Structure formats: structure tokens, C-alpha cells
Design a protein around this ligand. Structure first.
Ligand SMILES: Nc1ncnc2c1ncn2[C@@H]1O[C@H](COP(=O)(O)OP(=O)(O)O)[C@@H](O)[C@H]1O
Ligand SMILES: Nc1ncnc2c1ncn2[C@@H]1O[C@H](COP(=O)(O)OP(=O)(O)O)[C@@H](O)[C@H]1O
Lengths: 260, 260
């Protein structure tokens, strides 16, 4: 294959940034989006998108829209409509501050075959090549038998693996600083996880599901070369350091980093 | 090529039914959908969809959502969000009466190259093969230079031409009985138009734009074998005759038929 230089010293070629629904919605409130949170995140995502023009996707968690859309197995089709709404809210906000943000329906581009997502549309690569920011989300995907399955926003980065050349960095922003070991309301963050043998990270989740889906996806991505992070999102936080080699990140940043 | 039997005696293999925004919305009222009209059309479309299971698409006009979305050339991106909403309203209504209706974002599946729409996603054919009803609409499409263009719902049938095997029937339901000749508020319907030389139909539109886009699309489709109709939609009308060979249609039906 092509030898790809990789390491903590290296700059990513591509950023897949996933923003958790817990950060901008409330499950106690169907389709409450927090517009202030969306507004402030959007400003920080826009700076990333300018640097990584054509080299970034933003993936939204389904939040309140999602959880109600999966709360007659064709009834899951409603999910694609609920996640489109969230994409629309991000994209609208981004375009309002000068970003060329375009929502794409993953269900129109991707199907499942033997449980593995298959990118079936060339449009995503074209949109990136034109310098636009795809806004993606979880979705209802058809499998090879015609059955719909809820495909989490956390697994969307897996879809990029065959498409992205060079070094992919995947960042999953959530409401915790990473994978915590020793307690549900517990003890320290696991800073590093080796995707080749991540048994200790899975063991920490048992100690205290959503997080299990995240780990599964980011291990999958890391086993194909990606550098992956689970870390805390905050609408007003500067994110410029996500452009930088990991060894150059500021000292205050906490995360769980998943790599091979 | 494969010789395809065709004629007024023959049954269509595929139905592309387009429902005009004038039939279920009002341009004088931004995003007024007429829910009663949607409800009643949906019942008639559901009967078609059962017969043409896996062999039909429903295409919605953009109505009030559309016209406001096209009323900073990346600002057209808002169109894809406005037409997704209309797809969602049809699909939701259809699923409520037992149809496996799934909205698909044309912009996630199709791009323009030298002005010709190019189906770039295999998902549409898969959804049909699974026996589902794609719900489609007009959209903002990217061209090969990265420019967005508003692609009318009336032109969506063109996208099906390379994909559909056998005899395609395209039916564009609007607020007039067909192409009227001799007056804006004028004289008789043109019953037949030969797509090879449709100069008389274009001349009738000058006699009294929207209709020009319809003619252009249906001539394009007819020149590749399709049997096309412009006729009046009415939410409560039975549509079962659209399953039948043209020579067997009831005598009360008025239309403009476009064929080679
Ligand atoms: N070992 C663990 N480390 C960190 N978080 C955990 C762990 N086990 C369970 N969680 C839960 O996972 C949540 C993050 O996943 P989730 O609610 O799906 O986030 P998002 O909305 O950001 O997708 C945390 O709020 C936490 O309550
Ligand atoms: N020669 C013609 N024959 C029929 N309709 C015409 C003609 N010229 C212009 N029109 C206009 O085209 C309209 C249908 O196109 P449009 O408003 O785009 O319909 P839809 O909302 O159903 O797409 C008619 O209401 C009519 O007012």
C-alpha cells in the first residue's frame, strides 16, 4: 500500500468532528435544541472548517430529535427525517456565519452489507473536493435484505475510512472528559487506548452503552489508521488545537486517545 | 440494444408521478401545506404504490417551501433543506396509511455535469428493489465546478432515464388539464405532442415557464422512450387508471400526452 507517515508529531489531513446531542439538546425535552449552544459551537467549528476546507466533516448527534425517532419496522424511516432536521439546524447556523455548510442524508448515500456501512454515493467526496463542509448525522440505513437499522452518529466516522487519504483525526465531543476508570461517578481518565487490544477500556465501561458505541466505532477507525479522541465539548471552547499535532496540544486538554 | 415493446396497448413497467406544489400549498402563504390535500392525494398514491411496489417514485413539488428557498451563491443550499421538508410531509403521511415511503435527498445522490443530471448513488435503485416508495423532490445540485443550481421537481424524472428498465410512464399532475392552445385563459388542450418535433407545444406556451420546464423535461424523457403526461391533479381523484394501458383509460380523462 502507500506508506503513510503517522505519529504524535504529525498534522492531520482530515478532521471528522462529532458533536454529541447531550451538548446542545435535552432528552427531557423533545426537539429542544439549545440555540445558544448551537450558535457558539458553530463559531468554533467555522474556524476549523476554514483551515480544513474540503478536509473536514461535522457530524451531529441526533439529540432530542433522534431519541424520539427511535423511542411495522419501517417505522424507523422517521429517524431519517428527525436526523435531517438536526443537520439542517447546524448547516443553517454555519452558513449564517459564512461557512459553506451542506447537510447530506446518510441514508441516501450509505447502506449496510454484512453489518458494515458501505458508501454508495460519490457525492460526499465531490462536496469535499468543492471545498464545502458536509454536515452529517446518524440515520436509518437499509441493509442488503431491505431492513432498516438505526445507525448511530457515533459510527458515522467509519463511513469515511475507505474514502479519506492520509491521516484522519476523529474527535467525538461529549459530556465527559474521556473514558473514566474506577466508577459511575468515578476516578480517572484513561489517556491512551491501544486499539489493537482495548480490553481495559471496555472493562471501564462495565465499572460504571452510548459510550460502548463510541468505543466500538473509534477502535474500528483506529485499526484503519485514524487517530481518535473522546473528550469534553463546551460550546464556547476554542478548538484550534484540533488542527495541531497531538504532541503540540495545550497542557490543559484532557482526552482519551485511541490509536494503534 | 434490448428491443422494448411499446405502445398505447402496453402496460407501464414504472410510474414516476409528480405532484405540483399548486395542488397542496399556497405561494401566498410560506410553508402553508394543505394537510387535507396531502391526506387525500396520499390515499390515492398509496393504491398506486401497492401495485407498483418497487416500480414507482413519488416526486413532490417544492410548493411554498421551495419558492421561498429560491426567492453568496451558496445561499441556495437552503433549498435542499426546504425540499427535504416537503418530502418528509409526504413520507410521513404515506407511512401513516401503511406505505413504505422513504424520503431521499436528491442532492446527496445526483450532481450536474455539462448541465445533465448524473445519478451518483446506488441507493435509489436499492430502495426500489427492496419494495419501498422513494419520495423525491426538486433540489439544490452541485455541478462539476462546485456551483449550486436549483433543479426543479419537474426535471426529476430525467434522473430515472438511465436507471429504469422497460416502459417508464411519467405523469405530471398540475392545476391545468394539459397544454392549452389559443390563450392565457384560452381555448383547447393539445392531446398529443411528438417529442421529436414539439414546436407547436412550445408555441402554445408563448400564446399564454413553470410549464416550459415541464415540457422540456417530458420531451427529454419521451425522447428516451418514456410515455409522459401533463394533466390535472385533484386530491380526491381516483388514479387507478394510471396503471393501465393508455388506450384503456376512461373517456373522461383529459391530458397532454408526450411521446416519440
Ligand atoms: N466509563 C465511562 N466513562 C465516561 N462516560 C461513561 C462511562 N460509562 C458510561 N458513560 C456515560 O456516557 C455518556 C456519554 O455518552 P452519551 O450520553 O451517548 O453522549 P453524547 O450525547 O455526547 O453522544 C456520559 O455522560 C456518561 O454518563
Ligand atoms: N399553454 C399553457 N397551458 C397550460 N398551462 C399554462 C400554459 N402557459 C402557462 N401555464 C401555467 O402553468 C401553470 C402550471 O405550471 P405550475 O404553476 O408550475 O404548476 P405546479 O405547481 O403544478 O408545478 C398553470 O397554472 C398555468 O397558469
Amino acid at each position: 500500500s502507500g506508506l503513510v507517515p503517522r505519529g504524535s508529531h504529525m498534522t492531520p489531513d482530515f478532521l471528522a468532528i462529532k458533536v454529541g446531542g447531550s451538548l446542545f439538546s435535552r432528552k427531557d425535552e423533545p426537539g429542544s435544541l439549545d440555540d445558544d449552544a448551537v450558535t457558539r459551537f458553530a463559531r468554533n467549528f467555522a474556524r476549523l472548517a476554514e483551515t480544513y476546507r474540503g478536509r473536514m466533516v461535522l457530524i451531529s448527534g441526533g439529540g432530542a430529535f433522534g431519541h424520539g425517532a427511535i423511542r411495522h419496522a419501517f417505522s424507523l424511516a422517521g429517524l431519517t427525517e428527525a436526523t435531517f432536521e438536526v443537520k439542517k439546524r447546524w448547516a443553517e447556523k454555519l452558513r449564517g456565519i459564512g461557512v459553506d455548510a451542506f447537510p447530506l442524508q446518510l441514508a441516501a448515500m450509505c447502506t449496510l452489507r454484512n453489518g458494515i456501512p458501505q458508501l454508495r454515493s460519490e457525492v460526499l467526496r465531490d462536496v469535499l473536493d468543492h471545498g464545502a463542509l458536509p454536515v452529517l448525522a446518524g440515520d436509518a440505513l437499509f441493509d442488503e435484505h431491505g431492513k432498516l437499522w438505526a445507525f448511530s452518529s457515533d459510527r458515522v466516522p467509519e463511513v469515511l475510512l475507505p474514502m479519506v487519504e492520509g491521516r484522519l483525526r476523529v474527535v467525538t465531543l461529549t459530556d465527559v472528559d474521556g473514558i473514566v476508570t474506577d466508577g459511575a461517578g468515578g476516578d480517572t481518565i484513561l489517556p491512551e487506548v491501544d486499539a489493537r487490544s482495548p480490553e481495559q477500556a471496555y472493562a471501564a465501561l462495565w465499572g460504571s452503552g452510548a459510550m460502548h458505541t463510541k468505543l466500538d466505532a473509534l477502535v474500528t477507525c483506529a485499526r484503519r489508521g485514524a487517530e481518535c479522541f473522546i473528550m469534553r465539548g463546551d460550546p464556547g471552547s476554542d478548538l484550534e488545537f484540533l488542527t495541531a499535532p497531538f504532541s503540540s496540544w495545550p497542557a490543559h486538554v484532557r482526552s482519551t486517545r485511541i490509536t494503534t
